[PDB]
């Protein structure tokens, strides 16, 4: 009669509808419709299990809920499911798609007959027709695995976070895999700061053949030992001895070489490639990949399988045979093996139709065209004939010294043709055809000085590579790990490189000390493997959840105790010699979620003797020189002072335009501090950058009695914005107007009226706690028209009710950056709108 | 109308009706040709046809 197909994306809905036709209706169920509770809408344990929804002691009883704005979509889905005869759950291949399909089946009801689980790797006529010829049942095991993961992460977050608030600082968060990623970054930071760049020199030689060709070589042995002078004088002596000596080509080596393409990309490989070639990080890469998949041009972008369908292989082999021809075929397909634990049922990330060139993607933004070009190029490259190089190696001897050249010359190019290198390498040159035992004539020689490379910093893609190596997280997780480590304030990313905040070090050390089992890489990997076993149906979800929860609760109940008992150590203050501008006292070095700062011990004294004066630790932001290449990090390490008490490097902060402060890397475990004088261009407060809408000057982030505000450096302008729960900074501060007469409804608060680029909106006076917002009605504004600032008055003039007598709400037309008024019935738009045009309000069908 | 008019006026198989004598009338109306659209051209008709 009329089948219903349910899908998570509206663009997936439009695309699958192109192939399904009139016998089917397709509906988009945008995101997770059902979930565990999120807002406030032995009694401490009772309140904890209510806030969690999950009760670990009462056998995992979960108390799922439907989130605000989902009720309309749930009602539409239910109405369509009542109209339909058979329901087709067409979520993506992975667990999350199974958990969405489960929530859909459970909300809509009638399980035993009225559901089919559709499964397709690409949104195309043949794949869809084959999937609808043979749909499955809902894989409940994978749903259970996803629920187990979610329950673990909520258990750890909600149980740990109050502990960290009590011991260390309010406004911390924690997470199972997140904390282990932070541990990785902090360990690399400690390796970097505790490293010494040594000094080695190298010599380079310039030579001409009897045939007048020219050759350049590098010098690598003295006295049959490795040539590695330690100082300048030694290098100059070596250069002298070299110049005096006479050179001959005692060694002539030659050999063919063959080079092959990489595998078609898995998600981690795609992120690494997009970072290295195009500069896209993780978020942009996965957003554009999701768009390309939803448009239909590429296969699903969450995969760890390198496998390819026979259809794909035949298509690409046809393309190569037609365009390139037989030399680049080659004789048989290039196989690639993924991990034995990989989702080998999945495909790689490949084009859906190899003939669609990136330029043809009319509806994709240019960055997405570039990403598609990368996917296409890799897919074509993987199956072609490997390339062919011939290689020459030369060694030349003079006195106590031997010096070497290596060069390769390229003679078949097949995979390199489609997928060229970014730049020529050091061996991508032509050594002249000197004979065996040839002679050489000599040109003047150059020394070079180089420093030992530290254990160099990880970027987003290299951190994803490290996680993939250890087995922490999975293809679906990686983007969430990389985002959440930043959002939670333990790690910051700058110069496309990862840097670890002092608070991340504190939390890492505390969590390692107290929760050693949770933070150990092996136990994280074993947990991920056990979730994979659950998805296999090798294990029982509730079982492993119970085992985890028992261990975690043991460690928590140990950790809660006093520090003399051995419980989690509280926050700590490292004193130094500095005069508090408010009392002169010695001053100590402190870490907050905002950063690292200088505090006066009177903060710990009761009101009578309390001192709230604080100083910002404006840091010397490391400015890595891109032109120094690999040197750039080494010289940064060289730039740092070294602590007197230990080898660990020191990190640098500005306290006055006259004074600067050095602090040891192992602070507060190490108590070394140094203070230095000089003419310094101090910022007063350092951190993020923001541009003042009222004067265009730089604007900077500052802390005080109300937490964190944002304030503009121009002394003639005091324009200040403010931080808010889930955004970089609030919109232009102009006339925030309070109303006591509008009550909130989910909370006891009262409503306030606010302006910004988003529009004009009502928001609740305890905003970080209430977080309740709704658009104003026109009649509301009219009721409080005297309060409205002079400009906003026009909105109160607007027509309060539509021609049907429905009621009207005030909306921002982002495409045209103007307010308009619109009416809704049953919560759907009536399709009526009125706009402001030259002092008048004009109204009609939308 | 344009298609009908063009077929009846300009098509190769709508030639002038010759009216010398009634025998001409009959033999012209009863004539059966292999030329025209979809047929074959004069300059390529071999002896086999």
């Amino acid at each position: 009669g009329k089948a219903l197909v349910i899908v998570e994306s509206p663009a997936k809905a439009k695309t699958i509808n192109k192939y399904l036709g009139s016998d089917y209706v397709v509906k988009s169920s945008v995101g997770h419709i059902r979930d565990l509770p999120t807002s406030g809408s032995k009694d401490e344990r009772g309140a904890l299990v209510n806030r969690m929804g999950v009760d670990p002691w009462h056998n995992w009883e979960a108390h799922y809920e439907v989130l605000p704005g989902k009720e309309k979509v749930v009602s539409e889905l239910k109405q369509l499911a009542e109209k339909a005869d058979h329901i087709y759950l067409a979520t993506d291949l992975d667990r999350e798609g199974e958990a969405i399909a489960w929530h859909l089946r459970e909300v809509i009801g009638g399980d035993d007959a009225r559901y089919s689980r559709v499964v397709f790797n690409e949104i195309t006529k043949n794949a869809i027709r084959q999937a609808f010829n043979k749909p499955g049942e809902l894989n409940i095991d994978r749903v259970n695995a996803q629920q187990a993961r979610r329950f673990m992460d909520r258990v750890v977050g909600y149980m740990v976070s109050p502990l960290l608030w009590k011991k260390i600082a309010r406004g911390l968060s924690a997470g199972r895999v997140q904390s282990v990623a932070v541990r990785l970054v902090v360990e690399r930071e400690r390796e970097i700061k505790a490293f010494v760049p040594e000094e080695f020199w190298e010599v380079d030689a310039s030579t001409t053949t009897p045939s007048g060709e020219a050759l350049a070589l590098q010098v690598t042995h003295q006295n049959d030992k490795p040539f590695r002078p330690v100082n300048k004088e030694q290098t100059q002596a070596a250069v002298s001895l070299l110049e005096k000596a006479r050179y001959s080509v005692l060694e002539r080596e030659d050999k063919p070489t063959t080079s092959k393409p990489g595998a078609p990309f898995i998600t981690s490989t795609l992120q690494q490639a997009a970072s290295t070639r195009l500069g896209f990080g993780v978020k942009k890469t996965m957003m554009m990949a999701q768009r390309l998949y939803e448009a239909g041009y590429i296969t699903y972008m969450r995969t760890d399988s390198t496998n390819l369908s026979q259809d794909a292989v035949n298509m690409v082999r046809g393309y190569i045979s037609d365009n390139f021809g037989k030399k680049y075929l080659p004789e048989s397909p290039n196989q690639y093996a993924s991990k034995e634990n990989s989702q080998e049922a999945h495909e790689a990330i490949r084009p859906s139709d190899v003939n669609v060139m990136a330029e043809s993607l009319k509806d994709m933004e240019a960055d997405a065209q570039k990403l598609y070009q990368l996917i296409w190029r890799q897919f074509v490259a993987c199956q072609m004939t490997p390339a062919k190089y011939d290689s020459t190696t030369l060694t030349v001897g003079a006195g106590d010294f031997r010096l070497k050249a290596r060069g390769r010359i390229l003679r078949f190019d097949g995979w390199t043709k489609v997928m060229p290198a970014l730049r020529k390498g050091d061996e991508d040159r032509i050594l002249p055809a000197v004979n065996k035992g040839d002679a050489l004539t000599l040109v003047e020689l150059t020394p070079a000085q180089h420093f030992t490379k530290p254990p160099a910093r990880f970027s987003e893609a290299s951190l994803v590579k490290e996680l993939e190596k250890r087995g922490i997280g999975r293809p679906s997780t990686y983007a969430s790990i990389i985002s959440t480590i930043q959002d939670r304030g333990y790690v910051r990313v700058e110069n496309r490189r990862f840097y670890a905040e002092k608070m991340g070090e504190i939390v890492t050390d505390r969590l390692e000390e107290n929760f050693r089992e949770l933070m150990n890489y092996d136990f994280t990997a074993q947990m991920e493997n056990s979730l994979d076993q659950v998805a296999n149906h090798e294990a029982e979800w509730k079982a492993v959840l119970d085992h985890f929860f028992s261990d975690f609760t043991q460690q928590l109940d140990k950790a809660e105790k006093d520090p003399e008992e051995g419980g989690m150590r509280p926050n700590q203050m490292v004193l130094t010699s500095i005069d508090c501008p408010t009392c002169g006292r010695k001053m100590g070095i402190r870490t907050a979620s905002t950063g690292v700062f200088l505090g006066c011990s009177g903060y710990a004294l009761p009101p009578k003797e309390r001192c709230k004066t604080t100083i910002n630790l404006v840091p010397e932001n490391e400015v890595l020189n891109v032109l120094e290449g690999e040197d750039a990090e080494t010289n940064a390490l060289r730039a740092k002072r070294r602590c007197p008490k230990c080898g660990t490097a020191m990190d640098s902060y500005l306290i006055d335009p006259k004074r600067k402060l050095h602090v040891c890397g192992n602070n507060p475990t190490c108590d070394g501090y140094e203070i230095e004088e000089g003419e310094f261009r101090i910022k007063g407060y350092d951190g993020p950058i923001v541009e003042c809408e009222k004067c265009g000057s730089e604007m900077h982030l500052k802390m005080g009695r109300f937490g964190k505000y944002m304030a503009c450096t121009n002394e003639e302008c005091k324009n200040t914005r403010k931080i808010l729960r889930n955004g970089e900074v609030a919109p232009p501060k102009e006339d925030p107007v309070p109303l006591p007469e509008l009550p909130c409804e989910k909370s006891d608060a009262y409503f306030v009226l606010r302006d910004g680029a988003a529009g004009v909106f009502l928001a609740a006076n305890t905003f970080p706690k209430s977080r309740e917002t709704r658009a104003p009605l026109v009649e509301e504004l009219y009721r409080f028209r005297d309060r409205l600032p002079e400009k906003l008055r026009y909105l109160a003039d607007a027509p309060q009710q539509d021609p049907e007598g429905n009621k009207t709400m005030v909306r921002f037309s982002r495409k045209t950056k103007q307010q308009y008024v619109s009416s809704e019935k049953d919560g759907k738009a009536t399709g009526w709108s009125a706009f402001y045009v030259d002092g008048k309000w004009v109204e009609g069908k939308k | 109308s344009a298609a009908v008019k063009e077929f009846f006026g300009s098509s190769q198989l709508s030639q002038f009706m010759d009216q010398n004598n009634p025998l001409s009338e009959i033999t012209h109306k009863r004539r059966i040709s292999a030329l025209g659209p979809g047929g074959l051209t004069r300059e390529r008709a071999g002896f086999e046809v």
Binding site: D311, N314, G318, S321, D353, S360 | -
Partner: protein, 50 residues
């Protein structure tokens, strides 16, 4: 012998070949190739044996 000589190995490759044959100078494409083939031979839109 014909099966020993045809470069093609599946339905898609043959469709690509026929597209490449009947219209030079334009890129092959799954949907367009399928559409022109079906409307050219197995549809009354363009073909009719009276």
């Amino acid at each position: 012998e014909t099966l020993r000589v045809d470069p093609t190995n599946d339905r898609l490759s043959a469709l690509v070949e026929i597209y490449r044959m009947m219209r030079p100078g334009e890129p092959p494409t799954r949907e367009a190739a399928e559409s022109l083939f079906e409307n050219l031979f197995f549809s009354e839109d363009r073909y009719d044996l009276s």
